Amino acid sequence: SFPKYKPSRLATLPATLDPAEYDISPETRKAQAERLAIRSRLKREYLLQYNDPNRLGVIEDPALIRWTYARSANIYPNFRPTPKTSLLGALFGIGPLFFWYYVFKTDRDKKEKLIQEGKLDQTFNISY
Amino acid sequence: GAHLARRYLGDASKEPDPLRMPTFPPDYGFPERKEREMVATQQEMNDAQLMLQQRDYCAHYLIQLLKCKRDSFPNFLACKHEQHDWDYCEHLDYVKRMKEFERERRLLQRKKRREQREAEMARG
Amino acid sequence: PDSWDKDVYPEPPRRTPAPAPQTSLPNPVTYLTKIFDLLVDRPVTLAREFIEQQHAKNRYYYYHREFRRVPDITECEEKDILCMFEAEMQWRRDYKVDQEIVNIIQERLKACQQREGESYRQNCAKELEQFTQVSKAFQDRYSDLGAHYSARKCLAKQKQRMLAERKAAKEAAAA
Amino acid sequence: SDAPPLTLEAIKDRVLYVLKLYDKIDPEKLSVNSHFMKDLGLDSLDQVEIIMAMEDEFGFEIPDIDAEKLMCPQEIVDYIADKKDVYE
Amino acid sequence: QQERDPWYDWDHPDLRLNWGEPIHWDLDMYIRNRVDTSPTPVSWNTMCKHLFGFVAFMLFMFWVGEIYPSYQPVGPKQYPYNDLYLERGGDPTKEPEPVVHYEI
Amino acid sequence: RHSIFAVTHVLIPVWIIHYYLKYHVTAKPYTVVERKPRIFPGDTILETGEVIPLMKEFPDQH
Amino acid sequence: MNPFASLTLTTLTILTIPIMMSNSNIYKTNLYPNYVKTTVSYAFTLSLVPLLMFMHTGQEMIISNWHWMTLQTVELSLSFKMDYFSVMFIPVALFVTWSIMEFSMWYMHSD
Amino acid sequence: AFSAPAAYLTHQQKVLRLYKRALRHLESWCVHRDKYRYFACLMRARFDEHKNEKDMVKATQLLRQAEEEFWYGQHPQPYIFPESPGGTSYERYECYKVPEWCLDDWHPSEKAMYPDYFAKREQWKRLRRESWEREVKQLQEETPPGGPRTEALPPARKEGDLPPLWWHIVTRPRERPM
Amino acid sequence: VHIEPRYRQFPQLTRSQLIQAEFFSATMWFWILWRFWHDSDAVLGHFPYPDPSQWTDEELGILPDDE
Amino acid sequence: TLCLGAITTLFTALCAITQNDIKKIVAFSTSSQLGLMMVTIGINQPHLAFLHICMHAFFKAMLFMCSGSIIHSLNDEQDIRKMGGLYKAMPFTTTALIIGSLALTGMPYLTGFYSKDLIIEAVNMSYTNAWALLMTLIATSLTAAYSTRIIFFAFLGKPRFPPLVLINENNPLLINSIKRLLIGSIFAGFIISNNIPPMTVPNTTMPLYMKMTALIVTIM
Amino acid sequence: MLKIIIPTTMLLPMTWMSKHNMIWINATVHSLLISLISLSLLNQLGENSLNFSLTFFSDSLSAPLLVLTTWLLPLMLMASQSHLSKETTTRKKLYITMLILLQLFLIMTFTATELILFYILFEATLVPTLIIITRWGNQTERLNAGLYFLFYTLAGSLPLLVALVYIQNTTGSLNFLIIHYWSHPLSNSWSNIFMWLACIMAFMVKMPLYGLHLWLPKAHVEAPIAGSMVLAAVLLKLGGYGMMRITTILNPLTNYMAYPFLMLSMWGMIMTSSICLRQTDLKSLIAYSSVSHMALVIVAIMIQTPWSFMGATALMIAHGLTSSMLFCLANTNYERVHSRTMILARGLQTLLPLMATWWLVASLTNLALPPSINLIGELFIITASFSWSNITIILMGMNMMITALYSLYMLITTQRGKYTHHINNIKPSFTRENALMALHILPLLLLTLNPKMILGPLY
Ligand SMILES: CCCCCCCCCCCCCCCCC[C@@H](O)O[C@H](CO[C@H](O)CCCCCCCCCCCCCCC)COP(=O)(O)OCC[N+](C)(C)C
Ligand SMILES: CCCCCCCC/C=C/CCCCCCCC(=O)OC[C@H](COP(=O)(O)OCCN)OC(=O)CCCCCCC/C=C/CCCCCCCC
Ligand SMILES: CCCCCCCCCCCC(=O)SCCNC(=O)CCNC(=O)[C@H](O)C(C)(C)COP(=O)(O)O
């Protein structure tokens, strides 16, 4: 009837256009009930300490600690040398260095060769 | 535009090239051409510090206008005659440039047609 | 003023035209100039007169330090450390003096570019030539020495240039 | 200065004013404690239109989840008073 | 984080997060001060086509206009003293080739 | 009390600036450079009194 | 001594006085916006004079007043140019800023 | 923002939300009031044409088609109220909102001014201290053993109790604090 | 100057603002009319644009297709 | 430089004509004027660009002040779709905004005329890219287009704002500021144009149709 | 120059004989007096250096470093006393002793006239820093950090020692003056290449160079605030000073031996600037900022031009001051909330306005805002690199775009937004922290007023 909208990585699909939310099952209703149960339990836990008159300081969040620890300290223990990991490391850590070395070496060789022939227009080039 | 349409759609071989112009020598169609004369000396133009783009054959009127502008400073509505004269002689210079362009155009078209006709006569 | 020598820092004779009024209207610029004079330049002049009168009561002098010439690095043996030290200090002082000379010429060029207005391209080309000459000489002397420069490196550069010029001249002679 | 410090009576007056211009609502039968569905016999779409009229009148949006619960003009007045910190 | 419901009573309203819920691995990239993935009225890969077509068309037409310039039917501007030979750089000891302009 | 603002915000800073420019900045070469004033045919120089001659008998295309 | 340079320098100098006063007992009262507006208006009417001087005689200047530092052959100085562009743009910006500040006093009253 | 959300949205709620969104976007398209009234009555007729569909499957299919049409024909730049999450004054005043506990850190010289206000503040703090334990006990007794299932909180029921978890809702800074 | 809200009525207007607005609109239109009356050439052009086709061949000097 | 200026002015003028936020419209107008300034620089006319900067400052700042007055009156509302009939409710603001819009559109003998008209007539008579010229003409038509959009949606018709009328522009600070910038936007163009020395070669000989191009495209 | 060395050796027993509640006051006042005394070393000549005796000499490259060290000691003392309040008197005296010994070793390091004594002191600086980091660090990782700090240095410095003694057997002396006056060219051979590498890698790992920088985040995050201050401000400049001193004998080999190090420095500058954008920790952001700035310094030293040398010296001084201020600013928030996660406490401008101003000034100076000396050094290095090769302006330019981003990002993450609701222990800032920030920031602008004094001997 109307032109379709196709989602992308940086422009996702709207909730009202998701087929999965218009074909439902009582299993899905049960899953939503459990989701709301966990969220309500966590909210109650937060609000109990949030309103405590005798609480002074920062309410420690295990989720934040987990996030930071996973992002920083848990990476090397779970690292395995695989063809993908090794190839990506070699590429992203070696290719740029040699590419830039080639570029700068070529430019400087051209500059020096022009200097030797005496045609560079180096007048007023006092500061270096 | 009509010149652009003629050169870019019609036959551009008989259309003058603004970058490469003139292609004919100045005394070809004229038995004699008078040399254009300049009224303001190099030293006067240097001392007035007009600009490198205002130092054309029209600089005398510009110097006069600047002098009368400086003299009647608070009355900024008094230098109308000098401005009008400078604008008029600018307009004359522009008209001369149009004359040169049209002369070059008719020279090219006439010469090309005459060469084609001479070749046709020599081909029969 | 006489604070600086006018031969090292020359100027044109500074021609200025006389005012030629052509209108009956008053000129506000001269009125404002009179007000500015009477309201600013006179109190400042009085304060400066007081300052100079106080200074003239306590007059004392300071002197320019004079350095004699010591043997250059060419009169220096391979491992005579003391003569090397003296020659190296002399070379450094000459380097600073040369830099100041180039600075003076550059100031002259800037003064021309500002003063001449719209005719700077033609009216002050002599100083452009002066700067070109002094810059070429400075570049021949000191350029490409890099950090850790010394009298020995400059001498080696001069010897290399002399050898190249002598070879080129001897080749051109045979042509 | 800026807009005056809105009061409770003004809010109630504006609510009843905008409700009395509704063609489906009797002016005399309308009271501050009248129920839209029970007392006035309107459906859900009429409630949505009424809430939209309140949003247009007072110049601020009422979230849908909060909007569904309002059923009487007193509820709307209380919601608007709580939203804008009106206490007198 | 922009995709999340703004009408909810979040524990951290600015970040739109709740206490104790798992945090995305790339939260600092999606803090909504940053990369946004919210749906758009026009599909991705369609905005790209229109934008790229517009830029390419403008570049091509600018080049075409450069190769087909616009001017006025006039001759070159004339300057008196040998196209101001002394004015544009001096060199007063060379006697340049005279440049002559004639009346018309 | 009435025009005190124009004394402590205009007059004093301009006194200080004029003193500094006239007696310290101008004591060194090329510190203040002004572009040369324009000279036209017909003016008289203030210093030497030289009068610049007229300009080449206009063709008078009236 | 040709008041062009002094007036041009003073126009920029007097704009910083409220910045220096922002640590006094006027930044804490409600008269600060009026103080800044008056300062801007005075700066504009003072800058109006070098514009008149240029419009009369085309006078232009460069003032290299402070020598900050010098490299081997490059000299870095605190220098100002007072050509046509500067003397024409400073009063316009000052006028616009004056009007804007006046507008701000009423628009931003509740801030 | 005040009501506790439910587990899911009902079909009636989804249809009502679509109705509100469509009407608002149509108003965004139809700038003038009379044109908006005409097209809004047309939209109301369209909506209530199929109000009596006994089969839920076809009702949801109609809802799907309506959502697709809305997404295709939505206004790319819809009207947003100034203080709505998309407006130009959404979080303008959040820089002026300061929590109340900061007043505990004031120097006694600062507290010397406003003595009556700080007396009333002490009254409120003592009331909170005295009611916290009863609030906790009521929450403990009313909660099911498997923990709470929604985010709704109970009201007060006994002689002089206060609704549990009331301190940070009653003592909101303000909407226009400074 | 004190003005109170109207609630669905036309806002209260003081005479001064109407006077100012009318004066400034009138002065703008007067300025435009006066300037056009005195400086029409700035809009309609001052010097006539010639037609190159009407230029005789003698003044432009091209030979009559003979040599 | 000329190509960048042309593409900038065209694109921003095209974007401005569909915006509903008044501040966005004025911002896009400013961007289009900056693109026109870049075009003027690209045709080797720097002094004209500086004069256009000076001319544009006045009426651009004054148009923004009028928009801010409208926003402040209507309880911080910026969408023109809720801006009803303010022609009679805000007489001074209406007068100022109309004068500023006319000055922006290059109405003869106002502030925007003495720079924009000369810029257009200098672009039309130079050895430049043809596409840049066409884009400049389309942009200077779209300028009048979006100014018309602003005026039509903001000041004409029937009210569309909330019923609690708080419209009040009787404050000496706002009136004085807008009046000062209004006098500037009426006379500064003439005063400044007639008081500077000639830094450019004027275009005196011009065809009748091409001399009027800016006026024709603005009227269309 | 013993007039500065002896007062520190007198600070030692003065601290050890003070009353239990007067250690901080005495240490601070006499450290400030010693800084005032050391201010006199800035009167330098234009041709040769101040050769005090057969053992110590002062150039115009080491005088700003000495002034910076003597100025930094009182700041470290001021910052340290907040978190050491519960400590016993003897352990506080031991901490002050560690700081005093570190300052003394640095002072004798920057003025040793011979290379082997300079090596001895430059290696002796390891012990107090390691002891501080391992003993008074807060978290369990500190141990590992110390190890990463130690061996990474030693592996680079052990070959240098060998090279040094080898030079003494070849040229007969290690005195800097004799070495400079009797310099001879280095031929292109494998032995000369490995001599170059041995002489260079120690100062490369000290800077640190990209790829050799893994120890720096650990050491600068796990260390106490005084330790972080001393590593960031002064200890990273030892590598630069050593490289400038040692590159006099490596020519003309360096002319082609600098390519791998130049490529590493530039690309790792870009990489670390990119890393700073995605960082969940606030101290690691400052650490990687330090890595990027020292990579720029490495480039400047390697290209070997006078402008590059001046830029490098100015950049080292400015970076030291800026990084010390940033670390102190982060430590204030850490002491408030006991966590280094950046997104924990937000909207701190509403609660701490003057600290927000300090944050703004520090971040503006970090991103090289003109006319600060940071930008003076950065611009001189960029100009020298442009003279070296025109394409460098790409990479440098990229860095100059990325740096500012993360800087402002940090500010926007910490000071702006809305405050965390459950954090109610944010006390008003003390006079001590404000005084610390002011004493950090004012010398920066004062040096901006007179920039010729941190531009090195090439000026
Ligand atoms: C993570 C970061 C750590 C620090 C990284 C520091 C980088 C150190 C690398 C040292 C740079 C230069 C070393 C050698 C100089 C020349 C390089 C050589 O490979 O090029 C050719 C050399 O030819 C061959 O390549 C010989 C070398 C082959 C054997 C070396 C193994 C290279 C594989 C890379 C291993 C990685 C080394 C670093 C480990 C960490 C030049 O031809 P040639 O003119 O004849 O030799 C010049 C020397 N002469 C004058 C004495 C003759
Ligand atoms: C030469 C080296 C640099 C060249 C540029 C290359 C591309 C650089 C890419 C920068 C990546 C930086 C990542 C982190 C930045 C901070 C996060 C961020 O930017 O978030 C995006 C943020 C949020 O988006 P909003 O529209 O404001 O939405 C708000 C309403 N919800 O918006 C932005 O800041 C966008 C910034 C990215 C733009 C970069 C692309 C620019 C490319 C320019 C190329 C054209 C060059 C011009 C040449 C002219 C001819 C001389
Ligand atoms: C501008 C571009 C976008 C605009 C396009 C919009 C297109 C939408 C038009 C078509 C939509 C439909 O027909 S979809 C019609 C949906 N039909 C049903 O739901 C049948 C069962 N009826 C009910 O559930 C209730 O009666 C209910 C109707 C909810 C009333 O609720 P209340 O009585 O209790 O208030």
Q: Is G69 on the interface with A (CB under 8 A)?
A: no
With H, G, I as helix, E, B as strand and everything else as coil, classify residue F44. strand
Q: Is B29:I61 a contact under the CB 8 Å cutoff?
A: yes
Instruction: In whole angstroms, give the CA distance from residue H58 to residue D57.
Output: 37
Name the residue of chain E whose CA is nearest to B96's CA.
E104
Instruction: In whole angstroms, give the CA distance from residue C146 to residue A128.
Output: 8
Please state the φ and ψ torsions of residue F32, each to the nearest 5 degrees: -125, 115
Instruction: In whole angstroms, give the CA distance from residue K345 to residue K426.
Output: 10
Nearest listed ligand to the Cα of residue H46: 3
H50 CA → ligand 3 middle, Å: 7
| C29: closest CA of chain G, how far (Å) | 6
Instruction: In whole angstroms, give the CA distance from residue J160 to residue D27.
Output: 26
Q: Is K45:K457 a contact under the CB 8 Å cutoff?
A: no
In a domain, D19, yes or no: yes
DSSP class of K154: H
Tally of CB atoms within 10 A around A20: 7
**Count of CB pairs separated by less than 8 Å, A with G:** 6
In a domain, D2, yes or no: no
- For ligand 1, residues with CB inside 6 Å are K 188-190, 193, 211-212, 260
Tokens of K230: 């001393």
Instruction: In whole angstroms, give the CA distance from residue K296 to residue C161.
Output: 35
Name the residue type at position J79. Answer: D
Instruction: In whole angstroms, give the CA distance from residue G49 to residue G43.
Output: 11
Helix axes J46-73, J113-124, angle to 10 degrees: 130
Q: Do F46 and C41 touch (CB under 8 A)?
A: no
- In angstroms, the first-to-last Cα distance of chain D is 20
Name the residue of chain K whose CA is nearest to G72's CA.
K459
Q: Is J142:J17 a contact under the CB 8 Å cutoff?
A: yes
Instruction: In whole angstroms, give the CA distance from residue K418 to residue H94.
Output: 6
Closest partner residue to K424 among H94, H97, H99, by Cβ? H99
Cis peptide before K371 (omega within 30 of 0): yes
Q: Is C143 on the interface with K (CB under 8 A)?
A: no
Instruction: In whole angstroms, give the CA distance from residue H163 to residue H138.
Output: 9
Structurally, chain D folds into a number of domains equal to 1
Chains that touch D (3 or more CB pairs under 8 A): E, G, H, J
Hey, which residues 291-310 in chain K have their CB within 8 Å of chain A? Answer: 305-307
Q: Do J88 and I10 touch (CB under 8 A)?
A: yes
Name the residue type at position B74. Answer: P
Nearest listed ligand to the Cα of residue K193: 1
CB < 8 Å & 24+ apart, contacts of D80-87: D80/D11, D80/D15, D80/D54, D81/D8, D81/D11, D82/H2, D83/H175, D84/D6, D84/H175, D85/H172, D85/H174, D85/H175, D85/H176, D86/D5, D86/D6, D86/D7, D86/D8, D86/D11
DSSP class of B35: B
Q: Is the CB of H26 under 6 A from ligand 3?
A: yes
Which among H27, H44, H47 is the best mutation to test ligand 3's pocket, defined by most ligand atoms within 8 Å of the CB?
Answer: H47
D59 CA → ligand 2 middle, Å: 35
The three-point CA angle C18-C24-C26 to 5° equals 70
Tally of CB atoms within 10 A around E14: 19
The CA–CA distances, whole Å, from H136 to H123, H165, H167 equal 20, 9, 13
Instruction: In whole angstroms, give the CA distance from residue C13 to residue C1.
Output: 14
Q: Is C146 on the interface with B (CB under 8 A)?
A: no
CA H87, chain centre distance (Å): 16
Cis peptide before B16 (omega within 30 of 0): no
Name the residue of chain G whose CA is nearest to F30's CA.
G64
Q: Is E89 on the interface with C (CB under 8 A)?
A: yes
Q: Do J129 and E70 touch (CB under 8 A)?
A: yes
Q: Is E7 on the interface with D (CB under 8 A)?
A: yes
A90 CA → ligand 1 middle, Å: 19
> Quick check: is D46 catalytic?
no
Q: Is E84 on the interface with C (CB under 8 A)?
A: no
CA atoms within 13 A on the CB side of I12: 10
What DSSP string runs through E35-65? ------SS-TTTHHHHHHHHHHHHHHHHHHH
Give which of K148, K266, K119, K255 is closest to K193, Cα–Cα. Answer: K255
In a domain, D79, yes or no: yes
In a domain, D44, yes or no: yes
With H, G, I as helix, E, B as strand and everything else as coil, classify residue C16. coil
In a domain, D43, yes or no: yes
Q: Do K459 and G71 touch (CB under 8 A)?
A: yes
Which among K398, K399, K413 is the best mutation to test ligand 2's pocket, defined by most ligand atoms within 8 Å of the CB?
Answer: K398
Range(s) of the domain holding residue D67: 8-84
CA J55, chain centre distance (Å): 10
Length reported for chain H: 178
Assess whether chains G and I touch, using the rule of 3 or more C-beta pairs within 8 angstroms: no
- Resolution rounded to one decimal, in angstroms: 3.1
What DSSP string runs through G25-85? TTSSSTTHHHHHHHHHHHHHHHHHHHHHHHHHH---EEEEEEEEEE-SS-EEEEEEE-SHH
Closest partner residue to H168 among A17, A22, A51, by Cβ? A51
In a domain, D1, yes or no: no
DSSP class of K205: H
Catalytic hit among D13, D26, D43, D82: D43
Q: Is J33:J18 a contact under the CB 8 Å cutoff?
A: no
Closest partner residue to E73 among B26, B46, B101, by Cβ? B101
- For ligand 2, residues with CB inside 6 Å are E 34, 36; J 4; K 277, 397-398, 401, 405
| E38: closest CA of chain A, how far (Å) | 6
Assess whether chains H and A touch, using the rule of 3 or more C-beta pairs within 8 angstroms: yes
Q: Is H71 on the interface with A (CB under 8 A)?
A: yes
Q: Do J50 and G89 touch (CB under 8 A)?
A: yes
Instruction: In whole angstroms, give the CA distance from residue C19 to residue C21.
Output: 6
In a domain, D73, yes or no: yes
K193 CA → ligand 1 middle, Å: 9
- Whose structure tokens read 């920039």? K451
- Whose structure tokens read 């007969």? K172
Tally of CB atoms within 10 A around E31: 20
- Whose structure tokens read 């801010």? J68
Instruction: In whole angstroms, give the CA distance from residue J186 to residue J179.
Output: 10
Q: Where are the alpha helices (DSSP H) in H11-114?
A: 11-29, 33-49, 56-73, 108-112
CA J43, chain centre distance (Å): 21
Q: Tell me the chain C residues in contact with residue K248 when contact means C-beta distances shorter than 8 Å.
A: 148
- List CB contacts of C130: < 8 A, sequence separation 6 or more: C105, C108, C109
Q: Is C118 on the interface with B (CB under 8 A)?
A: yes
Instruction: In whole angstroms, give the CA distance from residue K383 to residue B39.
Output: 50
What CATH number should be reported for the domain holding residue D54? 1.10.1200.10
Tokens of K128: 């107090």
Q: Tell me the chain J residues in contact with residue B20 when contact means C-beta distances shorter than 8 Å.
A: none
Length reported for chain G: 111
Q: Where are the alpha helices (DSSP H) in D2-84?
A: 8-20, 44-58, 64-69, 73-83
Nearest listed ligand to the Cα of residue H23: 3
Radius of gyration of chain J (CA): 18
Name the residue of chain E whose CA is nearest to B32's CA.
E102
Q: Is F24 on the interface with C (CB under 8 A)?
A: no
Distinct helix (H) and strand (E) counts, chain F:
2, 1
Please state the φ and ψ torsions of residue E12, each to the nearest 5 degrees: -115, 90
Nearest listed ligand to the Cα of residue H73: 3
- List CB contacts of D61: < 8 A, sequence separation 6 or more: D55, H81, H83, H84
In a domain, D41, yes or no: yes
- List CB contacts of G75: < 8 A, sequence separation 6 or more: C103, C106, C107, G67
Q: How was this structure determined?
A: cryo-EM
Q: Do J54 and G92 touch (CB under 8 A)?
A: yes
Give which of H74, J15, H70, A8 is closest to E43, Cα–Cα. Answer: A8
Instruction: In whole angstroms, give the CA distance from residue A52 to residue A44.
Output: 12
Tokens of K295: 């990579």
CA atoms within 13 A on the CB side of J47: 12
- List CB contacts of K333: < 8 A, sequence separation 6 or more: K282, K345, K348, K414
Q: Do K263 and A103 touch (CB under 8 A)?
A: no
